[PDB]
Amino acid sequence: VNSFSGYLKLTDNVYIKNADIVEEAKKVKPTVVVNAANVYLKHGGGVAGALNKATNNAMQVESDDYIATNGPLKVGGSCVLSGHNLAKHCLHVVGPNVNKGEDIQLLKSAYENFNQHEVLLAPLLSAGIFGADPIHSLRVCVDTVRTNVYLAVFDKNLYDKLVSSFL
Numbered sequence: 489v490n491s492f493s494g495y496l497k498l499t500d501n502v503y504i505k506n507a508d509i510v511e512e513a514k515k516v517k518p519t520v521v522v523n524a525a526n527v528y529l530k531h532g533g534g535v536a537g538a539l540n541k542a543t544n545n546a547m548q549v550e551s552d553d554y555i556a557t558n559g560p561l562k563v564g565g566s567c568v569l570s571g572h573n574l575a576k577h578c579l580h581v582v583g584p585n586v587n588k589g590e591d592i593q594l595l596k597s598a599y600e601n602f603n604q605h606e607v608l609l610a611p612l613l614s615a616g617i618f619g620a621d622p623i624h625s626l627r628v629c630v631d632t633v634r635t636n637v638y639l640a641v642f643d644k645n646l647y648d649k650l651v652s653s654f655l
Protein backbone atom coordinates (compact mmCIF):
# COMPACT_ATOMS: atom_id res chain seq x y z
CA VAL A 489 0.00 0.00 0.00
CA ASN A 490 1.19 3.55 -0.84
CA SER A 491 -0.24 7.09 -0.38
CA PHE A 492 -1.20 7.90 -3.99
CA SER A 493 -4.94 8.72 -4.14
CA GLY A 494 -7.57 9.15 -6.87
CA TYR A 495 -5.66 7.40 -9.67
CA LEU A 496 -7.23 5.31 -12.36
CA LYS A 497 -5.51 1.97 -12.84
CA LEU A 498 -4.47 1.38 -16.49
CA THR A 499 -2.40 -1.80 -16.06
CA ASP A 500 -0.80 -3.96 -13.38
CA ASN A 501 1.79 -1.23 -12.77
CA VAL A 502 0.64 2.05 -14.42
CA TYR A 503 -1.80 4.52 -12.85
CA ILE A 504 -3.01 7.92 -14.12
CA LYS A 505 -4.65 11.04 -12.67
CA ASN A 506 -5.64 14.55 -13.84
CA ALA A 507 -3.36 16.51 -11.54
CA ASP A 508 -0.66 19.15 -11.32
CA ILE A 509 2.52 17.17 -10.64
CA VAL A 510 3.79 20.02 -8.42
CA GLU A 511 0.72 19.87 -6.18
CA GLU A 512 0.78 16.08 -6.22
CA ALA A 513 4.45 15.98 -5.18
CA LYS A 514 3.85 18.52 -2.39
CA LYS A 515 1.15 16.33 -0.91
CA VAL A 516 2.53 12.84 -1.38
CA LYS A 517 6.26 13.63 -0.93
CA PRO A 518 7.09 10.57 -3.06
CA THR A 519 10.46 8.84 -2.97
CA VAL A 520 10.94 9.83 -6.65
CA VAL A 521 9.42 12.61 -8.74
CA VAL A 522 10.37 12.57 -12.43
CA ASN A 523 11.30 15.81 -14.17
CA ALA A 524 10.84 16.34 -17.91
CA ALA A 525 14.41 17.56 -18.29
CA ASN A 526 16.58 18.67 -21.18
CA VAL A 527 20.24 17.69 -21.58
CA TYR A 528 21.44 20.98 -20.04
CA LEU A 529 19.10 20.71 -17.03
CA LYS A 530 17.85 24.21 -17.88
CA HIS A 531 14.46 24.17 -16.17
CA GLY A 532 12.80 27.04 -18.01
CA GLY A 533 9.28 25.92 -18.82
CA GLY A 534 6.84 23.08 -18.97
CA VAL A 535 6.99 20.57 -16.14
CA ALA A 536 10.64 21.44 -15.45
CA GLY A 537 9.98 25.15 -15.08
CA ALA A 538 7.07 24.44 -12.74
CA LEU A 539 8.99 21.96 -10.56
CA ASN A 540 11.97 24.30 -10.35
CA LYS A 541 9.76 27.28 -9.43
CA ALA A 542 8.22 25.22 -6.62
CA THR A 543 11.76 24.66 -5.22
CA ASN A 544 12.45 28.43 -5.21
CA ASN A 545 15.15 27.80 -7.90
CA ALA A 546 17.11 25.38 -5.68
CA MET A 547 16.64 22.67 -8.32
CA GLN A 548 18.31 24.95 -10.91
CA VAL A 549 21.22 25.80 -8.59
CA GLU A 550 21.87 22.11 -7.91
CA SER A 551 21.49 21.30 -11.61
CA ASP A 552 24.00 23.95 -12.69
CA ASP A 553 26.60 22.43 -10.36
CA TYR A 554 25.81 18.95 -11.76
CA ILE A 555 26.35 20.12 -15.35
CA ALA A 556 29.52 22.04 -14.47
CA THR A 557 30.96 18.79 -13.06
CA ASN A 558 29.56 16.17 -15.45
CA GLY A 559 28.55 17.88 -18.70
CA PRO A 560 25.20 17.42 -20.41
CA LEU A 561 23.00 14.37 -20.22
CA LYS A 562 22.22 12.21 -23.26
CA VAL A 563 18.82 12.36 -24.93
CA GLY A 564 17.18 9.25 -23.47
CA GLY A 565 19.32 9.50 -20.33
CA SER A 566 18.78 10.58 -16.74
CA CYS A 567 20.36 11.58 -13.47
CA VAL A 568 19.21 11.39 -9.85
CA LEU A 569 19.38 14.65 -7.90
CA SER A 570 17.65 15.99 -4.80
CA GLY A 571 13.88 16.22 -4.66
CA HIS A 572 14.18 19.37 -2.52
CA ASN A 573 10.80 20.17 -0.89
CA LEU A 574 8.88 18.01 -3.38
CA ALA A 575 10.24 14.44 -3.00
CA LYS A 576 13.25 12.57 -1.62
CA HIS A 577 14.79 12.41 -5.09
CA CYS A 578 14.19 13.92 -8.49
CA LEU A 579 14.89 11.68 -11.48
CA HIS A 580 15.68 14.10 -14.32
CA VAL A 581 14.82 12.20 -17.53
CA VAL A 582 15.47 13.56 -21.03
CA GLY A 583 12.86 12.51 -23.55
CA PRO A 584 13.38 13.49 -27.19
CA ASN A 585 12.15 16.99 -28.07
CA VAL A 586 10.32 16.80 -31.41
CA ASN A 587 10.58 20.58 -31.65
CA LYS A 588 14.38 20.02 -31.80
CA GLY A 589 14.23 17.21 -34.34
CA GLU A 590 15.23 14.37 -31.95
CA ASP A 591 14.46 10.74 -32.73
CA ILE A 592 11.19 9.60 -31.15
CA GLN A 593 12.54 6.07 -30.82
CA LEU A 594 14.62 7.52 -27.98
CA LEU A 595 11.39 7.77 -25.99
CA LYS A 596 11.60 4.08 -25.06
CA SER A 597 15.18 4.54 -23.80
CA ALA A 598 13.99 7.52 -21.73
CA TYR A 599 11.24 5.47 -20.06
CA GLU A 600 13.70 2.63 -19.32
CA ASN A 601 15.25 4.90 -16.68
CA PHE A 602 12.06 4.52 -14.64
CA ASN A 603 12.79 0.79 -14.14
CA GLN A 604 15.64 1.66 -11.75
CA HIS A 605 13.04 2.91 -9.20
CA GLU A 606 10.35 0.81 -7.55
CA VAL A 607 7.75 3.62 -7.41
CA LEU A 608 7.65 7.00 -9.19
CA LEU A 609 5.43 10.05 -9.66
CA ALA A 610 5.91 11.19 -13.22
CA PRO A 611 4.69 13.19 -16.21
CA LEU A 612 4.30 11.76 -19.68
CA LEU A 613 7.75 12.01 -21.24
CA SER A 614 8.12 14.12 -24.39
CA ALA A 615 4.55 15.47 -23.98
CA GLY A 616 3.66 19.14 -23.63
CA ILE A 617 6.30 21.50 -24.97
CA PHE A 618 8.49 18.55 -26.03
CA GLY A 619 6.09 18.08 -28.93
CA ALA A 620 5.34 14.35 -28.95
CA ASP A 621 1.88 12.83 -29.09
CA PRO A 622 0.89 12.13 -25.45
CA ILE A 623 -1.17 9.09 -26.51
CA HIS A 624 2.01 7.58 -28.06
CA SER A 625 3.96 8.53 -24.94
CA LEU A 626 1.44 6.71 -22.74
CA ARG A 627 1.66 3.60 -24.94
CA VAL A 628 5.48 3.56 -24.73
CA CYS A 629 5.25 4.08 -20.96
CA VAL A 630 2.92 1.10 -20.52
CA ASP A 631 5.01 -1.10 -22.81
CA THR A 632 8.38 -0.13 -21.23
CA VAL A 633 8.01 0.65 -17.53
CA ARG A 634 7.69 -2.40 -15.28
CA THR A 635 7.94 -0.59 -11.93
CA ASN A 636 5.00 1.24 -10.35
CA VAL A 637 4.39 4.57 -12.07
CA TYR A 638 1.82 7.21 -11.08
CA LEU A 639 1.29 9.55 -14.04
CA ALA A 640 0.07 13.11 -13.45
CA VAL A 641 -1.57 14.77 -16.46
CA PHE A 642 -2.09 18.53 -15.99
CA ASP A 643 -4.64 19.12 -18.71
CA LYS A 644 -8.10 17.74 -18.00
CA ASN A 645 -9.06 17.63 -21.66
CA LEU A 646 -5.95 15.58 -22.48
CA TYR A 647 -6.45 13.30 -19.46
CA ASP A 648 -9.96 12.40 -20.65
CA LYS A 649 -8.65 11.72 -24.09
CA LEU A 650 -5.82 9.54 -22.88
CA VAL A 651 -8.22 7.43 -20.79
CA SER A 652 -10.91 7.16 -23.46
CA SER A 653 -8.42 6.09 -26.15
CA PHE A 654 -6.38 3.70 -23.99
CA LEU A 655 -6.15 0.17 -25.36
Ligand SMILES: O=C(O)[C@]1(F)CN(c2ncnc3[nH]c4cc(F)ccc4c23)CC12COC2
Nearest residue numbers: 508509534535538611615616617640641642
Ligand atom coordinates in the same frame (compact mmCIF):
# COMPACT_ATOMS: atom_id res chain seq x y z
O1 LIG B 1 1.82 21.53 -21.92
C1 LIG B 1 2.66 20.82 -21.32
O2 LIG B 1 3.89 20.95 -21.56
C2 LIG B 1 2.16 19.80 -20.27
F1 LIG B 1 0.81 19.95 -20.13
C3 LIG B 1 2.82 20.11 -18.95
N1 LIG B 1 2.94 18.85 -18.22
C4 LIG B 1 2.63 18.74 -16.79
N2 LIG B 1 2.36 17.53 -16.35
C5 LIG B 1 2.06 17.36 -15.09
N3 LIG B 1 2.01 18.29 -14.14
C6 LIG B 1 2.30 19.52 -14.59
N4 LIG B 1 2.32 20.59 -13.91
C7 LIG B 1 2.63 21.66 -14.55
C8 LIG B 1 2.74 22.97 -14.13
C9 LIG B 1 3.09 23.96 -15.02
F2 LIG B 1 3.20 25.26 -14.59
C10 LIG B 1 3.32 23.65 -16.35
C11 LIG B 1 3.21 22.32 -16.79
C12 LIG B 1 2.85 21.29 -15.90
C13 LIG B 1 2.63 19.84 -15.92
C14 LIG B 1 2.50 17.78 -19.14
C15 LIG B 1 2.47 18.34 -20.59
C16 LIG B 1 3.67 18.04 -21.47
O3 LIG B 1 3.07 16.87 -22.02
C17 LIG B 1 1.81 17.39 -21.57
